[PDB]
Design a protein around this ligand. Structure first.
Ligand SMILES: C[C@@H]1[C@H](C#N)CCCN1S(C)(=O)=O
Length: 164
């Protein structure tokens, strides 16, 4: 199962790790993607997860969007996890760099409660522009299921743990 995680609360765990490498190692039931409403996996965690699937995630996502239209900010969809996980839960956190409401970050984390255990990044962190310390606080105060957070950046990981 998951190894090397620091336990933050009853159900939240954190590790300085590349979520793609972590997914390939664990092959969890659910890996969370830091998705956008169009499921265009260009950069950040989404670009890295999609590149690891050899673009199969993007091909599946384009078919999903063609059928269903875009997701809502704060919403999610379950698609295949390809070679990374059984499923990928594509969750759209608000993108502060697009002027999206940070209050939607709690709604985004509520999607995690539909899955008993997940490997995830901090929503709205990185290229989404939100403060990762705030994202971790919303995560611990919203998610009730078992969430294993992978934080790519060591310096950010140390800051998140030391300020928790
Ligand atoms: C925490 C969740 C659920 C929520 N939220 C309540 C029942 C228990 N589960 S479980 C353990 O099945 O993931």
């Amino acid at each position: 199962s998951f190894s090397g995680y620091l336990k933050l609360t009853d159900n939240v765990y954190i590790k300085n790790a590349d979520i793609v490498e972590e997914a390939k190692k664990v092959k969890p039931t659910v890996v969370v993607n830091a998705a956008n409403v169009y499921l265009k996996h260009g950069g950040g965690v989404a670009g890295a997860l999609n590149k690891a699937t050899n673009n199969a995630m993007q091909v599946e996502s384009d078919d999903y969007i063609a059928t269903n239209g875009p997701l809502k900010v704060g919403g999610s969809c379950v698609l295949s996890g390809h070679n990374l996980a059984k499923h990928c839960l594509h969750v759209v956190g608000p993108n502060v760099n697009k002027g999206e409401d940070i209050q939607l970050l709690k709604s985004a984390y509520e999607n995690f409660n539909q899955h008993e255990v997940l490997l995830a990044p901090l929503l709205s962190a990185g290229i989404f522009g939100a403060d990762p310390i705030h994202s971790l606080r919303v995560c611990v105060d919203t998610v009730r299921t078992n969430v294993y957070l992978a934080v790519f950046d060591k310096n950010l990981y140390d800051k998140l743990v030391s300020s928790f």
